[PDB]
């Protein structure tokens, strides 16, 4: 029932390695049975029922079962379970290519579109047909048989390369050993949580909860340099070899399909549409940010010269890569009086979660209830049921997986586990999502204390969760966050604005010790500090976007050299000789290839909506929130990103708010 929860989450998280292997085989056999049955139909016999509906049905069944098999590699604490899951992901990804390349299916979907009364089928069914045909042409199914076999072979290889690329980074366990003195200015609660060695030194890993604290706060330049050298050489040799195969393969299939570059190929599926629009977008933003980057680099260099003088260190006269985070942190402390380590005392994780959940219950018209004795993949994971506040409709459930552990996905992400689409019997499937982040553990007898940037990440990922749960579509392939890649960051970055509002920040904070609120003075400074270091921070994102475009435009370039080129030309901070940041650039292998610009591209839209609609009417306004839910989140991928923006804004979006939000107007 749309108003019950029992039995609607069919996901199981107690699978052994053998069951993951067995279920993978069974899923492939059963799913191929449907595709073979459709392909056996005479072309004159295809109907909506025996072709489109049968395919839509097996698509929702397949993707939910696939979730139980390819998700454990990210969260299970059992290493053999993670391996069986990665192995299953390899098999099912090859199977996905096989089924997508079937010419007998393509011809029947084309015949169906050409012969059915398109005015009399649901708009999303019309979209299903045209998107399926477009995908078929992007797999070469309209081209001769020899080129199809060639594309299929390269797709399978590219899939194994991408999975290996991210697997290498995910399982890397590099660590460095530092004495207490070499960790100067790092706080006791950080140092006491480190693993000790026999020589009374400390182990520091390259994971994010170790790397960035050292880079932000350690006052020993040699310590920062060694950490940066190691962090930006992770998997250097094996992932360089992968890129030297993967990037040319992307160019070759793109050229076989008729596209000039791989970037042209992927841009066609994005709201930006063309690579020349991406180039103009990045280059114009870079020009506007240039004087900001110059002023920030000049202030950082003066800070470094003073600190090297006042402490006796040597002064090389430049900003090295391992100096950037340290002096950006200094800039924030000096110009906005923000001590992140003091501020985190006011964001204990239970207070943040409560405030986060209450904010979006009120704004989006939802109610969240935590489930007791929930079936979860790890003891620390919690489960929540999401109901529509007004009607009681059970929209979905989400898991919160908040703390680090060995073998866990070590960045931040939201995973769609069940689509909120229609089922074979006409009922609606309950959406399921998982928020997977690595927040600080409770230490020193205190609860987990979140820095403001962790609160921001918490809101960012919860925006994705809300997109996955509120989206309701007829077809699984348009469900959840299956929008354009340069549009999927719109709902996540949208919610970030609620952590830069004074009244909202008051509801998110309470001192862990005495329960007191943040002082009004510090609250105002925290909100005003949003633009601190915005020049170099945004210029760095432009570097990454330009590098991603370039590697997928000219496939002959040395990746490390092209990264170094844009660092000095755009960021003004040279890449460390001997590093290879692209070899660690997991976005290149995780669905953001040629599309990393989409983060900045999305932020234009989210800033336009927040400024034009939420700041104007009040950011907790329930009917603006409901319009946001209905017009941006609820359609999922069943509408073009630009159509949903137009539906919400009642106009074309523009850059005015984004520029104002950055200090550029």
């Amino acid at each position: 029932s749309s108003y019950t929860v029992a039995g609607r989450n069919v996901l199981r998280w107690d699978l052994s390695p053998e069951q993951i292997k067995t279920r993978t085989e069974e899923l492939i056999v059963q799913t191929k049975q449907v595709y073979d049955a459709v392909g056996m139909l005479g072309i004159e016999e295809v109907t909506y029922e025996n072709c489109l509906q049968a395919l839509a049905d097996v698509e929702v069944k397949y993707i939910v079962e696939r979730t139980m098999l390819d998700f454990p590699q990210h969260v299970s604490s059992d290493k053999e379970v993670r391996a069986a899951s990665t192995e299953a992901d390899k098999r099912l990804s090859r199977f996905d290519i096989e089924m997508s390349m079937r010419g007998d299916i393509f011809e029947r979907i084309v015949h169906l579109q050409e012969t059915c009364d398109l005015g009399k089928i649901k708009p999303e069914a019309r979209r299903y047909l045209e998107k399926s045909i477009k995908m078929g042409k992007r797999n070469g199914l309209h081209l001769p048989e020899q080129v199809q076999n060639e594309i299929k072979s390269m797709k399978k290889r590219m899939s194994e390369l991408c999975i290996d690329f991210n697997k290498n980074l995910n399982e890397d366990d590099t660590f460095l050993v530092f004495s207490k003195a070499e960790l100067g200015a790092l706080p006791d609660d950080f140092i006491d949580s480190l693993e000790k060695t026999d020589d009374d030194k400390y182990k520091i890993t390259l994971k994010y909860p170790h790397y960035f604290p050292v880079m932000k706060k350690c006052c020993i330049p040699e310590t920062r340099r060694r950490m940066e050298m190691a962090f930006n050489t992770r998997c250097k040799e094996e992932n360089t070899i992968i890129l030297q195969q993967l990037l040319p393969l992307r160019t070759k299939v793109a050229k076989l399909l008729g596209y000039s570059t791989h970037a042209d190929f992927v841009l066609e599926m994005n709201t930006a549409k063309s690579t020349s629009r991406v180039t103009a977008f990045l280059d114009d933003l870079s020009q506007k940010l240039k004087p900001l980057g110059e002023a920030e680099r000049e202030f950082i260099l003066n800070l470094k010269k003073k600190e090297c003088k006042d402490r006796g260190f040597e002064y090389d006269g430049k900003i090295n890569a391992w100096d950037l985070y340290y002096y950006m942190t200094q800039t924030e402390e000096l110009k906005y009086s923000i001590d992140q380590e003091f501020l985190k005392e006011y964001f204990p994780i239970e207070v943040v979660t409560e405030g986060l959940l209450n904010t979006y219950q009120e704004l989006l018209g939802l109610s969240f209830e935590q489930m007791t004795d929930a079936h979860v993949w790890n003891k620390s994971v919690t489960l929540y049921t999401v109901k529509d506040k007004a009607t009681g409709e059970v929209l979905g459930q989400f898991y919160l997986d908040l703390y680090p552990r060995e073998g866990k996905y070590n960045h931040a992400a939201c995973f769609g586990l069940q689509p909120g689409c229609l089922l074979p019997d006409g009922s609606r499937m309950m959406a399921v999502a998982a928020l997977v982040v690595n927040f600080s553990q409770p230490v020193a007898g205190r609860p987990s204390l979140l820095r403001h940037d962790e609160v921001r990440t918490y809101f960012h990922e919860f925006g994705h969760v809300m997109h996955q749960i509120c989206a309701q579509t007829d077809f699984a392939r348009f469900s959840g966050t299956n929008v354009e890649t340069d549009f999927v960051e719109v709902p996540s970055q949208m919610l970030e604005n609620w952590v830069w509002d004074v009244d909202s920040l008051r509801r998110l904070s309470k001192h862990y010790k005495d329960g007191s609120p943040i002082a009004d003075d510090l609250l105002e400074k925290l909100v005003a500090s949003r633009l601190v270091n915005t020049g170099l921070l945004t210029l760095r994102q432009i570097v990454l976007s330009k590098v991603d475009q370039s590697l997928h435009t000219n496939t002959s370039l040395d990746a490390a050299s092209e990264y170094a080129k844009y660092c000095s030309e755009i960021l003004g901070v040279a890449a460390t000789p001997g590093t290879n940041m692209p070899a660690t650039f997991g976005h290149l292998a995780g669905g953001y290839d040629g599309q990393y610009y989409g983060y900045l591209w999305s932020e234009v839209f989210s800033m336009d909506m927040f400024y034009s609609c939420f700041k104007k009417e009040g950011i907790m306004n329930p009917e603006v929130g409901m319009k946001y839910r209905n017009l941006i989140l609820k359609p999922g991928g069943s509408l073009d990103g630009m159509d949903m923006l137009h539906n919400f804004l009642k106009r074309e979006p523009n850059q005015k708010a984004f520029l104002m939000s950055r200090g550029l107007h």
Binding site: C414, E489, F585, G590
Partner: peptide, 7 residues
């Protein structure tokens, strides 16, 4: 698979 910024 929807992840954030690489810092």
């Amino acid at each position: 698979p929807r992840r954030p910024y690489i810092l």
